[PDB]
Amino acid sequence: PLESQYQVGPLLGSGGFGSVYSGIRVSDNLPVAIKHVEKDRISDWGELPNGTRVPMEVVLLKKVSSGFSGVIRLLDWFERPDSFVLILERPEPVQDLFDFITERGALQEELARSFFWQVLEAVRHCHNCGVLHRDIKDENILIDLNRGELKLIDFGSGALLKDTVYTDFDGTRVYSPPEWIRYHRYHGRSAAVWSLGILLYDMVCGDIPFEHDEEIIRGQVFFRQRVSSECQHLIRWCLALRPSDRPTFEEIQNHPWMQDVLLPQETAEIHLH
C-alpha cells in the first residue's frame, strides 16, 4: 500500500536516524516526510496498544502525536522486509535550529526567549504523554519559518518516561549531564533540564558551552557573547552539577528572563520574514 499512497521526492539527509525523503500524500497533497529505518540497525523495540512489536521511536511518536504540539507528528507507518517506514509532517518552508544559528549566529534574547519557551512547551507535552526525548538539541528542533513555530524531531534515542534511574543513553555526548559522564546513571527530567541548559546557551552564545568531559564534570560556564545578568542565571541554574539543584520546568517557565514571551506569529514577523 505504501508506494502508491505517497509520492516520493528528493532526499533530505541521513545519519543515525535513517534516511528521509521529501514526499507528498496523493490523497490531499499534504507535504510529508518519509523516513526509512533499517531493522538490522534498530537497537530499541517496544509494543503498541494492540500489542505489535515495533521500534520504540514509533511507540513514542504515536503517544505524542495526538492533537497539536511542538512535535512533528507521525501520520502513519509501514513495515517492510528489512526497513520500517514512517510518514511524518513536513512544514514548508523550514529550517533546523543548527543551520539557523550556523547562519545568523547568536540570537537576540527576545528571539531565544520565544524559541526556548516553545521547546519547553514541547518537552512538557512529551513528558505529559509519558515520553522522554533524551536528545534535545538544535538539530532536533525545526523552525517553520512562516508561522514562527518550533517542532521537535528525532525520537530514535528516546524512552518511556519513568521515575526510576536510567542507565542507558544513546544521545549526544556534549549534551549529556555530568551525572551520566561520571556514574553512568541519571533521571529523565533533571537530565532534560541540563540538556535545555545547554540548548539555551547555544541559542544566546551561538555555540555549545562544553566540548570535553572534564569541562562538563567541572560545570563552569564561560560566556563568549554579551548575555543578560538574568539569562546567565537561568542557564547556570539549568546546568547545576547536582541534579537536585536544577530547576523544574515550572521554575524555568516562571524565571524572570522567561516573562513577556512573544507569540509564534509575532516572532516570525520581527525576526524571520
Alpha-carbon span 111 to 23, nearest angstrom:
31
Between residues 143 and 231, which has the closer beta carbon with respect to ligand RTZ? 143
User: Is 115 assigned to a binding site?
Assistant: no
Closest CA relative to residue 74, chosen from 38, 37, 102, 120: 37
| Coil, strand or helix at 213 | helix
Alpha-carbon span 239 to 176, nearest angstrom:
11
Alpha-carbon span 95 to 145, nearest angstrom:
7
Between residues 102 and 259, which has the closer beta carbon with respect to ligand RTZ? 102
Q: Which of 6, 20, 113, 202 binds ligand RTZ (CB under 6 A)?
A: 20
Residues 82-101 that bind ligand RTZ (CB under 6 A): 88, 90, 94, 96
User: How big is the site for ligand RTZ, counted in residues (CB under 6 A)?
Assistant: 14
x/- map, 102-141, ligand RTZ, by CB under 6 A: -------------------------------------x--
Residue type, 89: E
Between residues 9 and 219, which has the closer beta carbon with respect to ligand RTZ? 9
Alpha-carbon span 172 to 166, nearest angstrom:
15
Residue number with the smallest Cβ distance to ligand RTZ: 154
At closest approach, how far in Å is the CB of 131 from ligand RTZ?
A: 14
Phi/psi for 70 (5° steps) reads -85, 40
Q: Interior CA angle at 72 toward 124 and 194, to 5°?
A: 40
At closest approach, how far in Å is the CB of 88 from ligand RTZ?
A: 5
Q: Which of 59, 153, 235, 262 binds ligand RTZ (CB under 6 A)?
A: 153
Residue 151 burial (CB count, 10 A) = 21
Element (H, E) at 96: strand 94-96
Cell triple for 10: 528528493
Site membership for ligand RTZ, residue 61 (CB under 6 A) = no
User: Is 96 assigned to a binding site?
Assistant: yes
Q: Which listed range, 11-19, 63-71, 105-113, 157-165, lies at the site for ligand RTZ (CB under 6 A)?
A: 11-19
Cell triple for 252: 524555568
Q: Which residues are part of the catalytic machinery?
A: 135
Residues annotated as binding site for ATP? Answer: 12-20, 35, 89, 96
Which residues sit at the interface with ligand RTZ, rule CB under 6 A? Answer: 12-13, 17, 20, 33, 35, 72, 88, 90, 94, 96, 139, 153-154
